[PDB]
Design a protein around this ligand. Sequence first.
Ligand SMILES: [Ca+2]
Length: 275
Amino acid sequence: AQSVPYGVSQIKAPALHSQGYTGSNVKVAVIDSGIDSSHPDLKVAGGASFVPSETNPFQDNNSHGTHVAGTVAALDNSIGVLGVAPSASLYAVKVLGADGSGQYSWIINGIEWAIANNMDVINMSLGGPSGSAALKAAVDKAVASGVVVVAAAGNEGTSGSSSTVGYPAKYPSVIAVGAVDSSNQRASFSSVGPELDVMAPGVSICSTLPGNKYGAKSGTSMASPHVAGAAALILSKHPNWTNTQVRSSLENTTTKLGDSFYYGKGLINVQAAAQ
Ligand SMILES: [Ca+2]
């Protein structure tokens, strides 16, 4: 039978699905460790690999990318889980290796690929402590080209009074996503700062794993695809909305939680955001 992960329900995605809004024709790039295209609960439309030693974007030797992708778009059928936007056209942009790391050049190459390939939504469940002029340029260009760019805020917790949001999430053009649990409490690991935008479920998230498996993972990497998936639902209902509109809508209709330094604008509500 199919199971609906708590997180999907929490952001109110099923309300949209019931209406017939499921992300059809929206192109979402998962920039990560690849996607196992052999998984019966996923449908990969395309993609590219920028990892010099791992040239097939459709082999995920890590598991991270497959898991993120399932959150965005696990198919609505009689098996496994259900994604936020089950009808989305999913692209595997492999910029991380088997070990879950990757060079900035690889990551940037992936963003440039996504712009050139007309992705509607980019999901970056990754980050580093330092930025670069090239990293900023690429995210800025994507936004200027009308792409919705979403990224995990980071898993650095709190540190005195400073921001622990990593890059590229830290850049204003990118939506920075922090993690909450099923009770709406901020996860202890969730990065904090004035650059945090919104929260989404990120603790014990059940999704797809390579080799026709399913398992839970925790992290802001798990939170981000709920927002990428949400953007895809909005776009399926309002195809003419610009990325700016999508973003404002998501931020403006959240369920307010605690202070913005810890929760940003609050928990997204795709139902409210979709008007
Ligand atoms: Ca399924």
